[PDB]
Design an enzyme around this catalytic site. Structure first.
Site, PDB file in Angstrom:
ATOM      1  N   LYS A 172       1.352  -1.159   0.291  1.00 15.09           N
ATOM      2  CA  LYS A 172      -0.019  -0.047   0.545  1.00 15.09           C
ATOM      3  C   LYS A 172       1.446   1.303   0.056  1.00 15.09           C
ATOM      4  O   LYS A 172       1.413   1.283   1.460  1.00 15.09           O
ATOM      5  CB  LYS A 172      -0.570   0.275   1.370  1.00 15.09           C
ATOM      6  N   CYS A 192       0.621  14.047  -6.896  1.00 11.81           N
ATOM      7  CA  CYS A 192      -0.434  13.387  -7.853  1.00 11.81           C
ATOM      8  C   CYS A 192      -0.936  12.455  -7.826  1.00 11.81           C
ATOM      9  O   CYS A 192      -0.877  11.834  -6.156  1.00 11.81           O
ATOM     10  CB  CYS A 192       1.113  12.366  -8.747  1.00 11.81           C
ATOM     11  N   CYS A 221      -2.259  10.409 -10.295  1.00  4.96           N
ATOM     12  CA  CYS A 221      -2.986   9.268 -11.268  1.00  4.96           C
ATOM     13  C   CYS A 221      -1.529   8.836 -11.709  1.00  4.96           C
ATOM     14  O   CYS A 221      -2.122   7.854 -11.920  1.00  4.96           O
ATOM     15  CB  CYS A 221      -3.110  10.316 -12.838  1.00  4.96           C
ATOM     16  N   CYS A 250       3.328  16.028  -8.678  1.00  5.41           N
ATOM     17  CA  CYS A 250       2.623  15.664 -10.307  1.00  5.41           C
ATOM     18  C   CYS A 250       3.584  16.018 -11.474  1.00  5.41           C
ATOM     19  O   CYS A 250       4.137  17.362 -10.867  1.00  5.41           O
ATOM     20  CB  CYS A 250       0.941  16.852 -10.518  1.00  5.41           C
TER      21      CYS A 250
HETATM   22  S1  FES Z   1      -1.744  13.789 -11.445  1.00  9.49           S
HETATM   23 FE1  FES Z   1      -0.708  12.590 -11.661  1.00  9.49          FE
HETATM   24  S2  FES Z   1       1.312  13.639 -12.883  1.00  9.49           S
HETATM   25 FE2  FES Z   1      -0.102  15.169 -12.334  1.00  9.49          FE
END
Ligand code: FES
Ligand code: FES
Lengths: 78, 64
Positions: free
Chosen positions: B12, B30, B32, B41
């Site tokens: 995790k 980030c 993503c 990010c």
């Molecule tokens: S939210 Fe992952 S690089 Fe921007």
């Protein structure tokens, strides 16, 4: 993927957020850090939380089902 | 799956930010799992969103 109207979202595709705020061009949340009340506040990085942008532990359910290892960002006052 | 490759030796992946340590007025974190500077990010979200018809983006930590 799979139109019955109702779209069944089958399989994968490339995306990671099937359901949250899909009307928004890009889902960005902001935190003014002095607004934090608890010493530790967990923020969701899995796009499954029922309290998104906060972590509600849905990451745990996602990880076990998908063989993944995602988890939250902990914002700390101290 | 959501995270293709980051820190797979951790069951995790959690990161912490002590908010008094932030340097920038706005620091993007980030959400993503594609950033080359994860947990920050680096705008990989934008490329991901374009390629995959997605709409994910960062958490912005702001001073003012
Ligand atoms: S939210 Fe992952 S690089 Fe921007
Ligand atoms: S619910 Fe999404 S990171 Fe915990």
């Amino acid at each position: 993927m799979r139109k019955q109207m109702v779209v069944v979202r089958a399989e994968g595709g490339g995306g990671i957020n099937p359901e949250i705020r899909k009307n928004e061009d890009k889902v960005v949340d902001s935190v003014v850090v002095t607004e934090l009340s608890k010493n530790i506040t967990p923020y969701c990085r899995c796009w499954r939380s029922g309290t998104f942008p906060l972590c509600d532990g849905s990451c745990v359910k996602h990880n076990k089902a998908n063989g993944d290892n995602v988890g939250p960002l902990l914002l700390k006052k101290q």
